[PDB]
Amino acid sequence: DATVPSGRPETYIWRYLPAPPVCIRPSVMMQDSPASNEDDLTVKLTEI
């Protein structure tokens, strides 16, 4: 349905990546090494 903006089919191709908030991918404190440990979504968006 193209009545509203973003109803255009080209918006369905990955062009902008809405990287999630930090609360969505919390970074845990003091695991193994003294340094904080990141998580999967953070690592993947870093690599992207």
Partner 1 sequence: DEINTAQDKWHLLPAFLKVKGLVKQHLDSFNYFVDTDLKKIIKANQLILSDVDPEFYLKYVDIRVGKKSSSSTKDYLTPPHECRLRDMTYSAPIYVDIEYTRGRNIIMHKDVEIGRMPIMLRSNKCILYDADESKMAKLNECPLDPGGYFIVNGTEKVILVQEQLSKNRIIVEADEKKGIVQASVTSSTHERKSKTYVITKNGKIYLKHNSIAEEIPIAIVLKACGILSDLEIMQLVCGNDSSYQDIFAVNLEESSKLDIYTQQQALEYIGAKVKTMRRQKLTILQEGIEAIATTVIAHLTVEALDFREKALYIAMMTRRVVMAMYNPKMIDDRDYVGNKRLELAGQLISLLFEDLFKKFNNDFKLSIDKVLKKPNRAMEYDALLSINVHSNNITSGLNRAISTGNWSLKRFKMERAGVTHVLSRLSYISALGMMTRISSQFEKSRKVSGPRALQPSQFGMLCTADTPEGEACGLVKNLALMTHITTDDEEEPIKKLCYVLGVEDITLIDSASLHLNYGVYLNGTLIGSIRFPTKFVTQFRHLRRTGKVSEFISIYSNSHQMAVHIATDGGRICRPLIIVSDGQSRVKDIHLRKLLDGELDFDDFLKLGLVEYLDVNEENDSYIALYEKDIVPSMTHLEIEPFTILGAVAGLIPYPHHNQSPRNTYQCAMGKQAIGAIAYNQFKRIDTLLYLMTYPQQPMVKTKTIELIDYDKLPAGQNATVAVMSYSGYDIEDALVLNKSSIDRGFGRCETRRKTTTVLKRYANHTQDIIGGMRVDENGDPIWQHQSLGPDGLGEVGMKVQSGQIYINKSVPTNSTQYREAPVIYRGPEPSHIDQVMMSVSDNDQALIKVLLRQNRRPELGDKFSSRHGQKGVCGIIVKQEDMPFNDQGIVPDIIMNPHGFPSRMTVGKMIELISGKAGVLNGTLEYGTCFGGSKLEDMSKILVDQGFNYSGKDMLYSGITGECLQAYIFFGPIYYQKLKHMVLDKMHARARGPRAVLTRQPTEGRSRDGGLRLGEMERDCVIAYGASQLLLERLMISSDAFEVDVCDKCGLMGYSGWCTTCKSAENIIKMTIPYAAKLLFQELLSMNIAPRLRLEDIFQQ
Regarding 14 and contact with partner 1 (CB under 8 A), the answer is yes
Cβ atoms of 28 and 37 closer than 8 Å: yes
Token pair 């003294």 is at which residue?
34
How far apart are alpha carbons 6 and 9 in whole angstroms?
A: 8
Q: How far is the CB of 17 from partner 1 (least distance, A)?
A: 9
Site string for partner 1, 17-46 (x = CB under 8 A): -xxxx-xx-x-x-----x------x-----
Name which of 45, 11, 42 is nearest 28 in CA terms: 42
Binding residues for partner 1, per CB under 8 A?
6, 11-12, 14, 18-21, 23-24, 26, 28, 34, 41
